[PDB]
Amino acid sequence: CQDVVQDVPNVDVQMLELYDRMSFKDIDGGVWKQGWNIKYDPLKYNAHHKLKVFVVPHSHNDPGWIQTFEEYYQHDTKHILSNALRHLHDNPEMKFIWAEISYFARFYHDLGENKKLQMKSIVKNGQLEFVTGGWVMPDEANSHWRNVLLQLTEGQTWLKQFMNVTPTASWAIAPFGHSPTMPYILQKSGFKNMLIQRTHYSVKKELAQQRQLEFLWRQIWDNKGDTALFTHMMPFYSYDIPHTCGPDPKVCCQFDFKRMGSFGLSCPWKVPPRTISDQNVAARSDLLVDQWKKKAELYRTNVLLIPLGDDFRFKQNTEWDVQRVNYERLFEHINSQAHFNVQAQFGTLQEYFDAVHQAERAGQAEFPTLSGDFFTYADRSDNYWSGYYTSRPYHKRMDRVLMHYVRAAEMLSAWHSWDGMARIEERLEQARRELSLFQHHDGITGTAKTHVVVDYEQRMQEALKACQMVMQQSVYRLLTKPSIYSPDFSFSYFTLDDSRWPGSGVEDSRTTIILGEDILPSKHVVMHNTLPHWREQLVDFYVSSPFVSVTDLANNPVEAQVSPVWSWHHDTLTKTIHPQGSTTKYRIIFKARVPPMGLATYVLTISDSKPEHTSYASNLLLRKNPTSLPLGQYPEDVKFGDPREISLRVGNGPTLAFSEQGLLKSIQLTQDSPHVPVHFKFLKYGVRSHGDRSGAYLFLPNGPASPVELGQPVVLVTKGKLESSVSVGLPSVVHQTIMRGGAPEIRNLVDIGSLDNTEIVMRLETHIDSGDIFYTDLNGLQFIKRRRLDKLPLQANYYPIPSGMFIEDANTRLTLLTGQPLGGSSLASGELEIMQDRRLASDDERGLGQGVLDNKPVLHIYRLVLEKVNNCVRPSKLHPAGYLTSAAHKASQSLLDPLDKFIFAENEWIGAQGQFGGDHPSAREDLDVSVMRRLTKSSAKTQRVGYVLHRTNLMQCGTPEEHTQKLDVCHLLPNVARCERTTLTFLQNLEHLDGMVAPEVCPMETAAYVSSHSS
Template identity: 25%
Template sequence: MKVEFNNHLANVNRRKLLKVFVNYIEQTRNDIQHAGVQYILDSVIESLVENPDRRFVYVEIAFFWRWWMQQTDEMRNTVRELVNQGRLEFISGGWSMNDEGVTHYNSIIDQHSLGAEFLRDQFGECGRPKLGWQIDPFGHSREVASLFAQMGFDGLFFGRIDFQDHIQRAQTKRMEMIWKGSSNLDEQSWLFTGVIPRTYNAPDSFCFDYLCHDEPMKDDPKLHDYNIPERVQAFIDAAHNQADSYTTNHIMMTMGSDFQYENADEWYKNLDKLIKYVNAQQTNGSDVNIFYSTPTCYLYALNKANRTWITKTDDFFPIAWNQHGSWTGYFTSRPALKRFERYSNNILQVTRQLNAFSNATLRHGIFPLSEAMGIAQHHDAVSGTEKQHVADDYAQRLAQGIDSALYVINEAYKKLLSKNTQSLPVPTQYLCQFSNISECLTIEGQDNFTLTIWNPTIQLIEDIVRVPVTKNYTIHSPTGEIIATTLIPISSPTRNIPGRTSSAEYELLFRTPIQPLAFNTYYFEAKTHMTKETKLPTRVTKNQACILQNQHLRIELDEKGNLNKIVNRDRNFEIPFSAHGLYWYTSFPGNNSAPEFQASGAYCFRPLTPSTFPVSSSRNITCTYTDEVQTALIIYNQWASQEISLYDQGQTIENEWIVGPIPIEDHIGKEIIMRYDTNIPSNGLFYTDANGREMIERQRDFRSSYNYTVYENVSGNYYPVASRIWIKDNQRQMTILTDRSQGGSSMRDGSIELMVHRRTLYDDRQGVAEPMNETAYGQGLVVRGKHFLIVEPPEFSALHHRIAAQRLFMNPLKTYALPNMSYVNYSINYRQTWSALNGSQPLPTNIHLLTFDQLTSKVFLIRLEHFFELKEDANLSRPVQIDLQSLFNVFGNITDFVELNLTGNLPLNQMNRLVWKTDNNESSYWKSKDSSPLKSTIVTLNPMQIKTFQVTLQ
């Protein structure tokens, strides 16, 4: 038996993010948690240099980068030598060890690309990670496995799966497998995957760190505390016990844990002795041989074993650590941070585009937001499983990154808006980041201002613009025409949100088309009276039954605000509702002393009973009708409301909810859900997305990978919903899209519920050490968000939900400016519309421009994705071609381009992954059909395929 020691820094800030990022680097606030990453690295490097047999692996580049920037050239050269020798190895290589449940695939790719770029630039090919190391996230996504495979990884190891799954896998030697990460892609998405024992810690009694209290190796037989015989036998027994769960004569022993190796010499000296004395027992018949190694070496040894492996096609969600500890609460925890992270990504992608198309060459100005986003993907960041002051720190970092990005946006618009170099200075652009609460103080009360909208997609869009105003305005379109507008009242729940300081009581609404990769500028000019271009609500009803309808849909509500039915007028079918609205589960108030007393907290969702309670026994409904939009405002009480909106010509229903402050005066924690109960016979099945991409079928109270015993019939059926969830029968499908990640389920046939907010009073004792009790402005946090409903036959649904989901995470960017000049003068001096496609033919509807990043003045990194699955749509699920040159017409001709792996750190034709065989006589061998040198700029994308290119211009 070969035992490979994997010395590692388990995870810089693992499950319990108790301190802010910089504290872990500098070892400050040790009253909260003792941890100093810089000292760990200092100590490890010294120990590696001392003995050439020793090894160490490192994962999260955010911390390493911070340490690296402070080192001398001599130290950097020493580290490079260790990397070249394979003694210090980077695995995974992301900026952080990202969560897998609530992260969006765009941000997962970005944060891994950020780390991969740094490693490539500093260490070359020897620094390129060869496998994924997700030892701490709370469940594992099939989409992440697929992405890792496309990044060129040969394997993936992690430590957390459901306790029932773990028991059954260990008993049947199924801890390692071939994970088929995509139901759409071929072998390029397959990834060897292993579950490591003990999460990532050392075997019991073998932790040799000052944070531990285990007995060291005492090898002087002249001393009374000599312990080598019993310590050696204990380790041999531990090795045999672990080997019982695995299929080859190789096992991997993880030797490290949270914040360890600050005194690496203590670890390594004890391990040196352990290796010496355990291997010496081979002369006495022992079959255990141990040595320093890395997970990559272990993986290669398994590959050389030349055996077949079981396969897996589903994912590892949800997981529970005991009978009543389902880690499903974090799917919703800190909903405001989850939304801010998604919003920040939107700004990051648009800023990259504007920087590139304007040739501003300010990539360094984008780095602060890119870096903040990378940290925010951590499994204790966007997951919401950190202390409150740490969550505040994440939000601050994102805000500072946005400020830096705004500088780049302004520099880009200086070039794109100016008609010539002699033009007047371009007015400064501002973001209205409180537009989610209908507040934009920059323009409030101004006599004139401009609104510039950038469309970041490669399709023509029709944007519905809502601007909070205190005056009535005439709006000039980019071509000079006066735009018809609608003045609609801002709802009282919105006006009363704590922290809102705007005096705006109306929003000016208008509809406008925007060309692909283009901006339009709209000039607002204040009027002292209503004009014929401004339309007011034509009718308002209160506490009466009402019907909202347009050309495609009809929504019927009764006088109590109950949603009775939705009718699809195009397809001539209806979906009756038996219940709809906001409800709450009672949080279990346990003391965590035993599984049956597990409390509901940041990680765990555990309701006291399966029953839900309406947030109010009565509702008030106000319906407002205009030519552009019809709305039904439903107010439950002072802390809960929703507003259903149906836009003219719209095929999607918008349901905006406001929840908070959740009352806790009754000393009861509450988990708030929005529930949609229909008569669709869904037969226990529902469907959720994986990180915003492929859909996975879920079955209530069932797991396809193991025999599942139900202990928690509510939280055990909750799944992460990063983008959408649906139920269906043969004729009807109801899809709900979310504007952030949320936990969701179908607890009964015909029903969908999404958890929108949580406020608990007990800690679940999983590491945060405080309840999930967010406050702001001296009271419980108020959260505002949106759901988008699509009701279509299953064969037509993909067309709507795929495109709508892309729009949700790649929204048009709106910036405001105060030009201090008349419209005539503004139109003379500045461009009011511009497109990067420069007259190109319309680009394919099913292709998305995922990344457009300028590396140097003539070199660009782009990612294109086909965002439809196989057989989803009769036309849009087919392979499609796109000419890369069409994206660069404003620059000139492409002279060279090469296809790269997903992280952009290796040419695709050099990506040679390990080949594995399954127990079904399948082979994981895959070679890109486009791996030969590309001669034409026309490329083909198949369903769910992402292609990355480095493009050089003339």
């Protein structure tokens, strides 16, 4: 295994280093507004050394943005694809590339067989080429790597089945900045080349000057280079035709033949295209070849990529003709005039890359190595696209919830083969496709119109119901005596109970377990653990009595805590925000112990008085002017006091101190240790009243944030043996700190209400001497070092926080893990901050055509880990990566992949069993089974199950936490007959494994295995 900590890679371009050196001046470059006037030596090309030009027609099709997926399909995309089929069929030299398989699948299944055959033939002959082949062209900032892989797999599995092709070149012209997670996944999925576009204009200029726009993109920790993927960065401001022929858009626009008027389009530079004729083809060719040779100056080979397309292009037959016939006339002239020394043709993306690598192998170029990312994007001036790290945070959180239930549904159902009547594959396919769709760069990003957001939400809600169905059917099968099992595949044997989605205060969706002497004495509940190690975790349920005790299915008592059900109300009569307690339902909490990838059953039983093994939390309401809080049968009376500082400790865990406003002020890790200052604060950013306005994409604050005025908020303290909390009703946020004996959990119920032109930020203030350094993750996969740059504006120092962030000095680290992607930064030494929501009245001129005025309450979740790190083996000061500790990693897992909870729906479960998976290996803590997916339907004689295994890298800090069992996924199901290593999509076998054993993977590596079973 390569060491991902101690060896700093030697790369030609390291993006953090480049950032430190670059001046980012925004000067007028001339016709290339963000560049310079390019010059070329005309004698560079000659008869023995020609410029080879590939014009690559394309059409950018958003799977929802300003219209829904289905609306765009009906209005635009079905016509684009129908006319592509006809036009390519009839014009054999014409070419076209296609990226978004969601749309292509939607189209193809509506074709008659004759047209399906015609379509297969233009793909097989290379006229129509799929690029990337994902379901969508995903966002790269907010998306989790697991869902990037999911959508990639969804599209490529479709393409292999129906088109018999697997793309090896990726096309990502539209995400708002770019992540190294993409080449990581793509390189492990058979890819050889990728293309990107939306990078900071200053980066484009810098790399163009050095001819470093094509590079071997490796991971930041990769000393050897085995992760490298050849990458092409386009050089100009847009992917449209004016910005793809060359540096002068006034000239390039004249070669977009849809802009002569009858299509309703024109050239903003005020010179229209003219139809090519024999009288003008020489002059027109001179202009165009000059543009091409200038673009070629920015690259190292004599092979040039010229994209030819724009959003929802190639719709009308007349548009196909006007582009094709004019370009054909240009190519005939240019290629026959030896003095240009050019050979130009329509091509595909793979044709371009193949020709580049032929030039490379001929010794005509050597490419630089690069590591780093391409965040935060700015397309012009100070317009940094850090707003979309937060926009529409409800749906960002929903993404993470659905991510987990897709994993859990696929895993739980994979253990068996299912009859088709069970509709398992149907429901899983729907769930995967709806989550996959949402990875679009207008989905999870929060950059779509209101009604489109609603469509994505409705789709995801259906997907969650599909996962629930599959999960609960699977639990019933896994835990019922086989000779008793009698399934009705439409029935709900269990319902899922989720304490954090949509959340208390967002939706009252949880079911109470109703027990009573005259109705039902007890209830079975089941926990699932998707992670491949034993886990203990507190779980809670709502119950109709406080006098409830818990047993395991050996009837062993389990210690439990009962607490009230508190809900917060904005009392419009008193103009305060305060909690009310239920008088008929209560929360019971207990520790569930669940096998690796397994299930555990418990029983809740009512009694007529306090049970021996159940304790009751105390409750203290801090506010002036209190009024009573009755709690029905709950046996401890609420206590009241004036606001005051208070401290809490659960178990032998940290002691937390809180201000009189209910906000953390310090953490004491152990009995004698210092009370370390760690202060939460809520602040507000506003919007500029002159110049450019913040919107869904852009964050353009009117200076540093101002503190939220808190008034005298009401504080609720619950103190229990198993779980304690401090909750406070602040303006726009019910803020909660929860303690269970380790790192606290933070929950924010965020309701920005009608606060227009406001962004609410949560900041942590410490004494940690972090300087200008902080760490943020990329797609939940890796942590990258950030350096705050005072030469850039505030919004430029905001980065995606898809799963966590930290600051550290020599001795102390503070890590904030998130259950949802949000934007954040460290704007001063010792600080962390993360945006909660944003409400914006203006459009920000990027095409959305609305503000963000559709906010809804969202429950954001976090873990806060303060640690001593002086004994940890960390990377050197020059290394661009950072790594989590064990405790921080486990805290992230507790947010993203919690135990699932199931409540048996009927009164009696006949044949119930206590556990599943007790013989599953308990793997080392850094290893995960990211995906378990049965790949075959029940009719297949040889069943196949796919696994994706990911090993992270945790710091060595002198805490072994060892003896663990080897995990061989190929022996998790019986009767294995073959085990193969595959690409991450499962679509190509890479190694036949001896002994049918799937080895574990190296730190920071991800591998896929497929086991086959005879059984």
